[PDB]
Amino acid sequence: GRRIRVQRKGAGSVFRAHVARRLGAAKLRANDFAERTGSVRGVVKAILHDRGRGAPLARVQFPNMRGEGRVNELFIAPEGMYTGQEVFSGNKATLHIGNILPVGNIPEGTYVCNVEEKPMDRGCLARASGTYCLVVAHNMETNKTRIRLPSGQKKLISSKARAMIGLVAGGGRTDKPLLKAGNAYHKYKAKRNCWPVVRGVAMNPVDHPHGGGNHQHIGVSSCVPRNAVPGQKVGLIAARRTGCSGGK
RNA sequence: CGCGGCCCGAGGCGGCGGGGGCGACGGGCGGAACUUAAGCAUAUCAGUACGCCCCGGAGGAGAAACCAACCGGGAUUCCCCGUAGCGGCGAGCGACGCGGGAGGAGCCCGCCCCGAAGGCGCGCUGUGGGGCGCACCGCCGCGAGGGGGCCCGAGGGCCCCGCCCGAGAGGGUGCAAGCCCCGUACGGCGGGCGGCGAGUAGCGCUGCUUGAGCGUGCAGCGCGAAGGGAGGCGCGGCCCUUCCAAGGCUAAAUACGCCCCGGGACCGAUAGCGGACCAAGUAGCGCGAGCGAACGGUGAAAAGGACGCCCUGCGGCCGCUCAAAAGACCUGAACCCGGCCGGCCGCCGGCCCGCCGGCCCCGUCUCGAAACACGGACCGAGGAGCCACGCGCCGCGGCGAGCCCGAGGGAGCCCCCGCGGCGGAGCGAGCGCGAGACGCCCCGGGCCCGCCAUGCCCCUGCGGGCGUGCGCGGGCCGAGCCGCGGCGCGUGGGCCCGAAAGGCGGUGAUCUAUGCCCGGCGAGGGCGAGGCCGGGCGAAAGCCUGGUGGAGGCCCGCCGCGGUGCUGACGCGCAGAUCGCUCGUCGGAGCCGGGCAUGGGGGCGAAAGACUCAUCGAACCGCCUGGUAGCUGGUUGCCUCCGAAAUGUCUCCCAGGACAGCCGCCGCCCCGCAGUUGCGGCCCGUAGAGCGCUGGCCGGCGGGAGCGGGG
RNA sequence: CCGCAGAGGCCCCGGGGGCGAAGGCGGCGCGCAGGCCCCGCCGGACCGGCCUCUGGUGCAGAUCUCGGCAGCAGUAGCCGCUACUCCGCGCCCCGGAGGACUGAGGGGGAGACGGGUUCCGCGGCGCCUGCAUCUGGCCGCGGGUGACUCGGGCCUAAGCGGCGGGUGAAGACCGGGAAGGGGCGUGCCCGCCCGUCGAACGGGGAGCCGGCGGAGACUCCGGCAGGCGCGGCCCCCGCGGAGACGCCCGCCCCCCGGCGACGCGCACGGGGACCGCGGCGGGCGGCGCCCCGGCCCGCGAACGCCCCGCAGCCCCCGGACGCCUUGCGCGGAGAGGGGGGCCCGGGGGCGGACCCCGCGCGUCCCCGGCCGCCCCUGAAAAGCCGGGGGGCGCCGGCCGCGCGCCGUACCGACCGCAGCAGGACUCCGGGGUCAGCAGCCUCUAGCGCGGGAGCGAACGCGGCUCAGGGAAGUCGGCAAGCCGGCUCCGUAACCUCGGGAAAAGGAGUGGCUCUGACGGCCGGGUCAGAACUGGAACGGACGCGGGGAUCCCGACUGUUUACUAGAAACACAGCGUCGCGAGGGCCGCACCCGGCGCUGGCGCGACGUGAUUUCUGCCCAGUGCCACGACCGUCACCGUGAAGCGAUCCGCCGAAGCCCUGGUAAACGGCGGGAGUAACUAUGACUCUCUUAAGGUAGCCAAAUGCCUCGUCGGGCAAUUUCCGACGUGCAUGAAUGGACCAACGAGGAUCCCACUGUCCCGAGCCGCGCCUCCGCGAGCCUCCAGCCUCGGGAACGGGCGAGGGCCGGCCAGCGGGGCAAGAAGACCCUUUUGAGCUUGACUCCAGCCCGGGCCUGUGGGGCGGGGGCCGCCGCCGCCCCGCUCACCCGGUCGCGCGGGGACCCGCCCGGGCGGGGAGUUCG
């Protein structure tokens, strides 16, 4: 046979993300001495649309603390943030929607977004439109805090990791049908080359393990083991069960 | 927080080096497959092709941590000579020592002693010096000797008579030249003590490699030393014989293309190099890597064509130069053709010559070809069992218990000298033992040697002698060595041409597939969604009606973009995919241009195994490669003498082979033969015949002990 | 033995030769033959008998190689693109006259790419210009491309390269962690880190008119302007307004900004150019009759100054149910009103330059303010400018100079072997008819293209008409025909309520003469009505749906086998499952390193089904997958114990895996037989029996799926192997390998009805081109030889052979019975110890991944188990756990005021497991 679609994707070429006309990487403000002691004030300048992304981005201007002038940031906007609003970051930031503060100072039961797994990594956990995390409990003896992820799993992170109050803006996007093939075309034209999708049973044996036969059908079981080598891992990988169980 | 030394680093300046090129030879790495094994996977091809790196006129190797087992040799290289071994123990593969030659050459550093005596801006983290005690090339030149007659366009021709010679090699000149010219032969000049190399040697595990076999050489990882290494079977112990690794240098004898010189039983213009021609790796072909032709000749001398006459010009005639037009050119065949002149159907035979008689188209495979089996329009030229090595047998020559142009050396292609080797004794796994008795020749017996087994005797004793018994090879008064020729087989492209494939290194996204960036484009109509305004109804919620508005992968339709049907035209085309009508779509998942990206078992794919420059169920270019073929086609003069088989056994054998049979040639010897009848002895169970045996099968008539049916 | 080429010898005064060698042509003789010899003619310088030696040594064939050449044959052919004629002069060149065409998406006028001199003048016909040629893109000889303002040179896009270094046997490939530059002017100050690479369409400082040559022009000349620099002379450090703002011009550094700079769309408004109508002036044509009715011309740039400029945005007074668009929209966060400011690719006046006058619909281009749309939001940089703070100081006017390098002719003359009906990007776009940039005719401009004449057979190609009938033709209504514009009337079942729908189906339409309606302080077209009148005619050419009733498949728009398949195949929205929380998942990759990822579960990746509606049954025995399930048995190296001279051998120890215990079917898949039985018969609700992991549920059916089979019954027909409706123990239906149903849609498959017709009964007539005859030009394929039949025998179907019957010789137009006609070493079938693609529970293996030990690799503490009761020595052996930081690793930061892990991981060596993802090979 020849190389499969999954094997060809990993080599780049016509399978790279289309990044032209993107505003940049969205991140929390970097951690420094000024906000390790007090608070730093900024102002929201604009709210913009990012190609490929479902959630809006906000441009926030802060004073420069190692010289003269100003510093421009790029945040993921929580719901309810408006142009001209002033926000704070630091150990002494107040509990308002746009503010950034460490999770140790956030009361249990609060909604947070753009949480950082390890201190000083600039956010990585709740970044897609409509998502949020919950602060569950604190442990002052070990200095660790428990959170609940959008998938429902529970994780322990250090109490010095920062987050933003609120939930990500743009919630409800997936409640509307795409309806037409032309809509999915535009959606994926803003992201990467991955659409439309040809079924494996509709191919010839030379280019997929599912192809061939006098009727269209999968010859064997579709569950493959975890240790299958790269050209073999197609179908359901290491599935614990299959079918529509119906219960919890 | 400052500044001096040492150490470790940074920027600049000066002077010196490096890099790239070379179809051979040389060194170091990486590393195939075709092919053979009648299949194939270990093996082989091959430590090859090819890729990468690096010198030189040579390179590399080199002065024992060597061979050997001897009444020993003694650094490296090159020539002559020849079997241990490895191996689906198959096919295949394969060294070295001893011996004879060419050439010949030896040494250093570290460690140890002194310590700046040194190459002095460096260097004690070591420069410099030493062992300490006993005892063929090039350049320049000169260079002899014939006339007369005849006849030719010109003689180097014919006849007669001469000369030169350290020169009679050759070339030129109007026809075969020692003496017509240049050259050829004969010249000159220049050039006792101290001290021996550590992440090493070795070992364990793993990979490659070798003839190296319980390891030939190398390497990775782990462990890791003091006297050490080797002696072609491992381990432990004790001896003997030999050498001193883990640092370095070195001439000679040897190999070889381009370029220059000489020679040849070589080719002679479809040959010889692809390339004999004032322009060839040229013209021309391909996006590119690459591919790559054809074309020689007047005559001694260009003397390369006078004059004249016709002609509207184009041209023609007549003649001129020359030995000759040999006139763009030597000679000038065949096929095919025009004129004039003679005939009427091919071949063989007879004849007073058109009558009679006979005659299917060759080559090939085949039981069988005129075949409706294949190849062949015609003509010319080219066109296919050669060579090397190995093995067997035959003939001839020389010498003969011997024989022998090895390499090489003597300045003599042909002369002189010149080792192995083979032969001379076999058998046996091996320790080992070891032949006489007869014979024109041949065959056969009989004895003897070795291997195996036995009986008796005895010294020096699992040792000697004598005898006996089967089988296998050898022997009994040596026949070989070298060379030349032939026949057959094997290994090499291997008589000539012919695959579908496999490998190595390179070149392409002008077409086409997908993506990204920058630009551009879409006549005219139809339908009439949300939102908004007026009027009416209603208790309220709300509803009814007229207008406005201008949504949509909506509809009709032009250019564009496609490609349905006629299964129309064309189908030696306009065209290696076109033309005409008819048709699908036409604001969108639309169409078009340029730039850029993805590369071959890879890419790209709204998926047809589609497309990737007329090439895709694996592109193109060159090379391995004249790849292999038990299969199809072809394989070139005459006469004479002999003359088959299409069967048996085995075979991954059934379209092929080996052994036997049939046949040819070459012989040799001298010993009665026969595909026949007659006479004498013995053997066989077929035709026919038959129903005694083994089976089968119609009835008739008698006896009834016993049994059954029925009266 | 004959012959060929060459070597060593002989050839009696030293072989034969211009008194004529080799070779060629014709003719005798000799030899069984292979061959040899002699004679005549041609030719013009070499040749060879005998002996010994040597070899690239003798041709009819190979779909042989190279060269030449025949018949066929004066044959096939010189059919697209409407067309030429008379005279000078010749069908083709030039001129005049006539007749036509392309038809503004041009056979027009110009560029980009590609070509490379094809361009121009003079001359010419040897080649080419498939006929001719006096012509030419052909041949010869001379010429021809001018830039401060146009393009390139500069910028950056998608990309490419470089980078102390890293890796690999190299070639090479990969790359942020590295003491990485300037200024002013000599001393100080500032500063983390690439590119004068990549766009003759994107960005960009500035050009217009007139004229001149033979071939060049935004380039030359004349005139009039712009931009950017340099040098002299004079030469200034801000005022007005109530405000929006105005008016006369400062630079350098740090920071903050702007311009450059950006989507699509139906409409609405403005400007320009084009177009048309009327008037006045100038010129022309025709004129049988009319004609102030026909045609042509009447021009004004860049740039400078002054006025005007709707909508938009802003200022002042003051304090509201008003203002206003086609649509909207706005107002106490300040409307209307009155009075002002700013921008506006534009217009007017005066200059440039001694300007005929008015009016209007439409077309194209550009601009404007709004509104609508997106799970789509519609480039960047050089360069230029402004503001704040700081530091500095003439900065403008006049007058002079200057502006380097390269492209530049011409062409669809380009690619397809060619002067090939193919392919090949863009710009400008008149009149009439009309909805129209459609079709048809035409002004401007261009131009008669592989040649002509005759004739008017068959037959072909492209067209036309046809009595009566009307699908009877045929596999099949294939082909052709019918319909069609606009206005009015009228439109069913069904439906996802949006459609169906132009459903179906009717009627009207010309010309002329009139009437009314709709604006403005002249104009315009449109809509409606009436009389009259033409062969019972009017969308009079052109352009332009035939319709209806049903079944199957796919929801729909879309895509596909370039060159035989456009579909029911693929895609699709929707639905469902599975994996992953970054120290992760999936993939690339020889190594170093990469992609998703400028990402973070409303995400990313892997699969199946395939809109809506209604549903989606039972089975975990098999195979697969999964257990932070369990360590039962087995299962490595290493380690450790016993024995041994040693090599070694025997035990223990026991990671993953398997085994074991469970879960899982929108995982792969699977889903039964035999008997008896109800008051006629028949059937079987019911009973018995064997048996599975479970025994096919809801549905559906002789279906695109039913062998038997043309199943049985009903409908439709005169008559039906077709079609529709039912029936069902269904060879072998069936539930996301999805079941059933379905409005809209379809160059999809199928049956019937209306209308229509040469499809047919059954053919006839006609038009143009070819054919045919002529002048000019002029090939391919094929070919053992030949070319009349019947029978026989024969490789079993003869042109030839045996026996009979016929036939002078030579040609033409046609034709398709033969020549087993041609085109190709059968692709079907078999064999060969010949392949390749693909599969897997064939056999032998490899990457990759998982798991264990050792090295890398430090510094401390502790627990357990082994060397009647222990106590062990504190040194012996194993396994295990918890710290610290210094190795090692990861993150943040411009190293401006700091983190996370950690002796584990990673890497390397050896060992075990998984492993059609991949490789090689076999398949008597």
Ligand SMILES: [K+]
């Ligand atoms: K799919």
Ligand SMILES: [K+]
């Ligand atoms: K080898």
Ligand SMILES: [K+]
């Ligand atoms: K045959």
Ligand SMILES: [K+]
């Ligand atoms: K045949």
Ligand SMILES: [K+]
């Ligand atoms: K011999």
Ligand SMILES: [K+]
């Ligand atoms: K390939």
Ligand SMILES: [K+]
């Ligand atoms: K046989």
Ligand SMILES: [K+]
């Ligand atoms: K009997």
Ligand SMILES: [K+]
């Ligand atoms: K440019």
Ligand SMILES: [K+]
């Ligand atoms: K020009």
Ligand SMILES: [K+]
């Ligand atoms: K899907």
Ligand SMILES: [K+]
């Ligand atoms: K199971």
Ligand SMILES: [K+]
């Ligand atoms: K069925």
Ligand SMILES: [K+]
């Ligand atoms: K019936």
Ligand SMILES: [K+]
């Ligand atoms: K269709």
Ligand SMILES: [Mg+2]
């Ligand atoms: Mg398919």
